[PDB]
Amino acid sequence: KRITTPYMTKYERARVLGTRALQIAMCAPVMVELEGETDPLLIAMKELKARKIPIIIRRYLPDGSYEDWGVDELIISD
Amino acid sequence: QPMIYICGECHTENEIKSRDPIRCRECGYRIMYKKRTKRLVVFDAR
Amino acid sequence: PYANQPTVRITELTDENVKFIIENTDLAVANSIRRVFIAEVPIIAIDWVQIDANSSVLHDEFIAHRLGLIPLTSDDIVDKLQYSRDCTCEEFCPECSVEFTLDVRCNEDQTRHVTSRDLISNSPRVIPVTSRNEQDDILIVKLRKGQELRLRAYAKKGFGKEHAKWNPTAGVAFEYDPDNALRHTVYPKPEEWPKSEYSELDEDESQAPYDPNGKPERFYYNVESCGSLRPETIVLSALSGLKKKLSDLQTQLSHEIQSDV
Amino acid sequence: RMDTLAHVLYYPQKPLVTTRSMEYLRFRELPAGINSIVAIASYTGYNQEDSVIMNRSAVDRGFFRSVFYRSYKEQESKKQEEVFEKPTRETCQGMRHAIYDKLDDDGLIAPGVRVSGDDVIIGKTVTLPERRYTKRDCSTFLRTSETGIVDQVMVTLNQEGYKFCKIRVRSVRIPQIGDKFASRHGQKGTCGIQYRQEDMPFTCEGITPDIIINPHAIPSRMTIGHLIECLQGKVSANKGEIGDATPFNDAVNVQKISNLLSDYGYHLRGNEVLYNGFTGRKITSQIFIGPTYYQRL
Amino acid sequence: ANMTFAEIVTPFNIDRLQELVRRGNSQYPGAKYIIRDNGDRIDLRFHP
Amino acid sequence: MIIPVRCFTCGKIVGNKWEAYLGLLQAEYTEGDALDALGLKRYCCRRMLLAHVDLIEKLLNYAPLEK
Amino acid sequence: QTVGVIVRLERETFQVLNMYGKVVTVRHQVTRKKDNRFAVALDSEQNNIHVKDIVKVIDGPHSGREGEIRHLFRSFAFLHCKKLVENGGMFVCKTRHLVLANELIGQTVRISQGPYKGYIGVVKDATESTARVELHSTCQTISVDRQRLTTV
Amino acid sequence: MNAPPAFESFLLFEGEKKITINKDTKVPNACLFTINKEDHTLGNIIKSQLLKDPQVLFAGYKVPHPLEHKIIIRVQTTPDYSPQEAFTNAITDLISELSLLEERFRVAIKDKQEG
RNA sequence: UAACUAGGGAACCCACU
Ligand SMILES: [Zn+2]
Ligand SMILES: [Zn+2]
Ligand SMILES: [Zn+2]
């Protein structure tokens, strides 16, 4: 059972969007459709709004254990 | 090869070579100035 | 939905200024006319100086900058001249430029004043304004013995939007509503404000009563020329230039509508 | 003088509003600044928070145009021998990708030659202590971000009897956005924007300001001497005299200057009705405008 | 024109980056270097 | 150093008026009367002549380096 | 005019195997040339080969061996075999006998056409189409098409 | 160093158009007129002449940035009218007004010169 | 038949926010 917050932090937002943008710029297959968008930042934004980013966030607890959260499992701020 | 300097005191056209000392040939003044260049000097009048 | 019917009354015409009134036109038209007076009336001014010798105390950029600001007679020649960028010659040609030559050598113990008399034109009608055949000559540089200034200058066509040396006007005095009937400016104490030259009120009055239905008309002008053009020629070429800009915009807009539709 | 870091203004003017001590400071004969028609106004918001709006048409006429001088010196030494000569790729090592043809046969550039950053102005070669390359390049270039015209090249002997050269580079500095301008009252400010004469506001006589400063520069600073100098400059320029601003002078106060200004057909407090340069409509507030002394820093 | 950002070449920006390379470092909207997949650096200041 | 060709503010020609201004000043005119006699009406043109310092006459006291 | 690769380090001489198949003995003071690591060579099958590529020898005096590409020439390729004991494994083979297993710079010009017409400048840098012109009158260096430039 | 050349305020470089037409989507019968290498001198007269037209419901111009040299004129008209012909009629009225003003100024020149 | 870089330190002074 996971005890961390169900909301997805702005630091998680920043790093997930950056990692996904770097992956898309390195020709990772996009999980959403593209309406002519070219910048991998905006593609990562559209992927995050659709909760389709294939990234698991491993939140490390201070006692040493971790908790694996999917991006789709977490509440997006916007 | 032929270089002209202008003496700072008496304003004399001075043919000197290279590696010889900067010395005015008829007044002995040791400061000379280069002449204005012969290249194209064109300014817009702004 | 249609055009104005503006009227012109000229109160003073002189070789150095024109002082006229435009009535029954809009404020934007009058202000654009003033803006074309300052910025968009083409004259001939020096814009290309080749310095061959300059022994003066002033360096070459200084002399070139002073030569650019010397006004030249531009009447009925600026219309014939093309812009230098628009002309197909390699160097300058008579169809787009006027060549000037200056060669002054000071061999006397007195100071030699290099003035606009020393600017020698290759065109009989594009000459410095002070060289017209009373007033003194525009001083370029002062020379002591041993100093010289040899240069070749080319004078081309341009307007004041590019550089202020092509501005043909000295002072464009512009007024509307001299008695402040529109209250477009609000005096905190209107008693201490001096009357305008075009004011139509008595000494006891300070400003006109407020007119709620009024618009700005009856614009007052005083276009003082720098001598490069006649002031009437300044106004006529300004009206022609604003007309030409509007006509060119009409042409491009018609092409854009035709291409889009 | 081959001074390092010399700045000279083209058209310095003595102040219209001066103190009597400036006669002994010799500020009249070597002035630093220009009397400029200055309106204190909020115009387009480009003069906000210690910034000024300059007249582009004034700057085209030489207003606050200055010239910057930088002197480069270099010796040739005999220890390893250094010589002033034009380097050649077939016999020199370490030559940069610069136009060495701007140098003359003596290894020195001539006056009147246009130079840019990383341009050789003095060609110096030092011999290797021990084939393809026998001499090493030790030439001097300009500063990387500096351009200009070579103004003067002076060649002489130094104290130890070696060949010594000094090169002065002339750079003409047009006032632009970001150049620092200050009044004589601690009111410094960079140029925010430059408008042409038709874009500047204008009086009924067609006078446009050379500099527009923000009204908010005044009240927290309490430089009332700025406003009084502006008023006295208006009176002096209309009257045809030089105004006296010696501090502890009871013969000069604000009311006397105001009455003198009112005698010349202006509003006594120095306000004028300005018109918008873009629309031609007169501004609702009457703008304080007059000649005051700025310095180009 | 002095500071650069390293943009990864995708099929979505191949033409824009190609014309940026073709413009080179002399024009402002251009490019300074090409970084190949093996880390080899191609300088566009000195024309290849 | 030398009189500007044009007034900075408006652009009226003032480069031809410095020698005439000096001649009027030595003819015992006041500076205001001398400015009025030269046609300088706006104070922008008036302080071009009123505030001018002629450094060029002091520069001419030095002999040129070439002659 | 000739390149080479040293096969043995000696005290005062270099043992270098050039494109001969013969080892020469030269002094220390040879010069250094920049290697073309991006050069392209062609084998007998007209296939592209580059540096660090294993190629087989199927023709020539030493057909049957196998080598690795170190340096390239117009019609020769340098080969290495770790099992070959002569001259430290260095050898040379021909490319076709294997199989894969400006004057304007510094010149004063006049812009004779365009918006900058009449400006005098010095070309700092130039290509086949454009040129970087250092304007004499301004502090700018601008990119001008070479069809608009006239050498003066 | 970074000074733009003085001709860029009025000279179209190779590639751009003088005036572009863009339809404004949020309201009907509205267009955005982006005009290059022009300033307040032309935008103000076009704006005021469009304001004289009773079939024009909105007429405004702006310079988005004074460092660049484009104006954007926004015209909204009545549904029985279009902003394109409103712009055309405004330019035509300005041209005719300037022609009348020029010929009357010439007449006044002759009157003042001949007394 | 384009062979492709920059250079030290220690003290002081001045200016700037
Ligand atoms: Zn001598
Ligand atoms: Zn021509
Ligand atoms: Zn003036």
| C56 and C24 assigned to the same domain | no
Find the DSSP H helices in H67-113.
83-113
| Contact by Cβ (8 Å): C154, C100 | yes
| Contact by Cβ (8 Å): G79, G67 | yes
Chains F+B touching (3+ CB pairs under 8 Å): yes
Q: Which residues contact C126 (CB under 8 A, 6 or more apart)?
A: C44, C72, C73, C74, C77, C98, C155
Find the Å distance, CA of residue D101 to C1' of nucleotide I10.
Answer: 39
Q: Which of D142, C84, C228, D115 is nearest to B44 (CA)?
A: C84
Please report where in the chains the tokens 């300004």 appear, as a residue: C238
| CATH number reported for the structural domain that contains residue H83 in this entry | 3.30.1360.10
Backbone angles phi, psi at H48, to 5 degrees: -70, -40
Please report where in the chains the tokens 């000569």 appear, as a residue: D85
F62 at interface of B, judged by CB pairs closer than 8 A: no
| CATH number reported for the structural domain that contains residue C176 in this entry | 3.30.1360.10
Q: Which of A4, D87, H93 is nearest to C1 (CA)?
A: H93
Q: Which residues lie across from D126 on neighbouring strands? A: D82, D136
Ligand nearest to the CA of C92: 2
CA distance H14 to G114: 10
CB environment B7-32: b (16+ within 10 A), e (fewer): bbeebbebebeeeeebebeeeebebb
| CATH number reported for the structural domain that contains residue F13 in this entry | 1.10.10.60
Protein residues within 5 Å, CB atom, of ion ligand 1: B 7, 9-10, 12, 24, 27, 29
| Contact by Cβ (8 Å): C81, C99 | no
Residues in chain E within 8 Å Cβ distance of G125: 26
Could you say which DSSP state residue F63 is in?
A: P
Residue type at B7 in one-letter notation: C
Binary contact (B40, G120; C-beta < 8 A): yes
| C183 and C250 assigned to the same domain | yes
Could you say which DSSP state residue C166 is in?
A: G
Backbone angles phi, psi at C202, to 5 degrees: -85, 180
| C114 and C53 assigned to the same domain | yes
Q: Which residues contact F16 (CB under 8 A, 6 or more apart)?
A: C115, C116, C130, C135, C136, C137, C138, C139
The full set of domain ranges for chain B reads 3-46
Q: Which residues contact A14 (CB under 8 A, 6 or more apart)?
A: none
In CATH, B3-46 is 2.20.28.30:
yes
Q: Which of D222, D241, D179 is nearest to D15 (CA)?
A: D241
CA–centroid distance, residue H41 to ligand 2 (Å): 29
Q: Which residues lie across from C8 on neighbouring strands? A: C22
Binding-site residue set of G: 34, 74
Tell me which residue in B39, B44, B46 faces G108 most closely, judged by beta carbons. B39
CA distance C92 to D44: 41
Q: Which of F18, C32, C174 is nearest to H98 (CA)?
A: C32
Q: Which of H42, H34, H31 is nearest to H84 (CA)?
A: H31
Q: How many domains does chain F have?
A: 1
Among all residues of chain G, which has the CA nearest to that of D102? G106
Max Cα–Cα distance, chain C, nearest Å: 77
| C154 and C192 assigned to the same domain | no
CA distance C56 to F62: 11
Residues in chain D within 8 Å Cβ distance of F5: 61-62
CA distance G68 to G52: 6
| Contact by Cβ (8 Å): C248, H94 | no
Both tokens of D124, joined, read 């110096």
List strands edge to edge, sheet with H30-36: H19-23, H30-36, H70-77, H56-62
- End-to-end alpha-carbon separation of chain B, Å? 37
CA distance D52 to D212: 6
Both tokens of C244, joined, read 């030409």
Please report where in the chains the tokens 């058209």 appear, as a residue: D11
The full set of domain ranges for chain A reads 1-78
Q: Which residues lie across from D293 on neighbouring strands? A: D35
Ligand nearest to the CA of B7: 1
At the top level of CATH, which class does the domain A1-78 belong to? Answer: alpha beta
Q: Which of H4, D145, D147, D67 is nearest to G122 (CA)?
A: D147
CA distance A53 to A72: 7
Half-sphere CA count of C126, side-chain side, radius 13 A: 28
Could you say which DSSP state residue D258 is in?
A: H
- Per-residue CA distances from D261 to D228, D256, F34 (Å): 12, 9, 20
**3-state SS assignment for residue C33:** helix
| C203 and C250 assigned to the same domain | yes
Q: Which residues contact F40 (CB under 8 A, 6 or more apart)?
A: F12, F14, F17, F46, F48, F49
Could you say which DSSP state residue C122 is in?
A: S
CA distance A55 to A16: 7
Q: Which residues lie across from G16 on neighbouring strands? A: G6, G24
Q: How many CB atoms lie within 10 A of CB F12?
A: 23
Half-sphere CA count of D223, side-chain side, radius 13 A: 18
D50 catalytic residue (yes or no): yes
Size of interface C-H (CB pairs under 8 A): 134
Both tokens of A57, joined, read 């966030």
| Contact by Cβ (8 Å): D278, D199 | yes
CA–centroid distance, residue C223 to ligand 3 (Å): 13
| Contact by Cβ (8 Å): H2, G142 | no
Find the DSSP H helices in C40-189.
60-68
Q: How many CB atoms lie within 10 A of CB C173?
A: 20
Strand pairing of D124-127 and D135-137?
A: antiparallel
Per the rule left: phi > 0, alpha: psi between -120 and 50, beta: everything else, E5 is: beta
Ligand nearest to the CA of F50: 3
Domain that holds residue C181: 1-42+165-261
- Per-residue CA distances from G54 to G78, G91, G97 (Å): 11, 13, 14
Helix (H) or strand (E) holding F22: helix F18-26
Q: Is the CB of D180 under 7 A from strand I?
A: no
Choose, from D50, D104, D106, D151, the residue flagged as catalytic: D50
Output the CA torsion H96→H101→H103→H104 (10° steps): 140
Q: Which residues lie across from D83 on neighbouring strands? A: D125
What is the DSSP track for A17-78?
Answer: HHHHHHHHHTTPPPSS--SS---HHHHHHHHHHTT----EEEEEPTTS-EEEEETTTSBP--
| C234 and C203 assigned to the same domain | yes
Q: Which residues contact D226 (CB under 8 A, 6 or more apart)?
A: D183, D184, D185, D187, D218, D292
Backbone angles phi, psi at H70, to 5 degrees: -125, 150
| Contact by Cβ (8 Å): C104, C149 | yes
SS3 content of chain C, % helix, strand, coil (to 5): 25, 25, 50
Q: Which of F17, G115, C160, D55 is nearest to B46 (CA)?
A: C160
Could you say which DSSP state residue G146 is in?
A: G
Q: Which residues lie across from D69 on neighbouring strands? A: D6, D170
Binary contact (B45, C46; C-beta < 8 A): yes
Residues in chain B within 8 Å Cβ distance of C64: 43-46
Q: How many CB atoms lie within 10 A of CB F10?
A: 29
Both tokens of D195, joined, read 């408008």
Domain that holds residue F52: 1-67
Helix (H) or strand (E) holding H30: strand H30-36
- Experiment type: cryo-EM
Find the Å distance, CA of residue C248 to C1' of nucleotide I7.
Answer: 60
| C150 and C59 assigned to the same domain | yes
CA distance D94 to D87: 10
Residues in chain C within 8 Å Cβ distance of H37: none
**With the C-alpha atoms ordered C45, C47, C51, C57, is the resulting torsion angle positive or negative?**
positive
Strand pairing of D51-55 and D287-296?
A: unpaired
List strands edge to edge, sheet with G130-135: G141-145, G130-135, G120-126, G108-111, G149-151
Resolution in A: 3.6
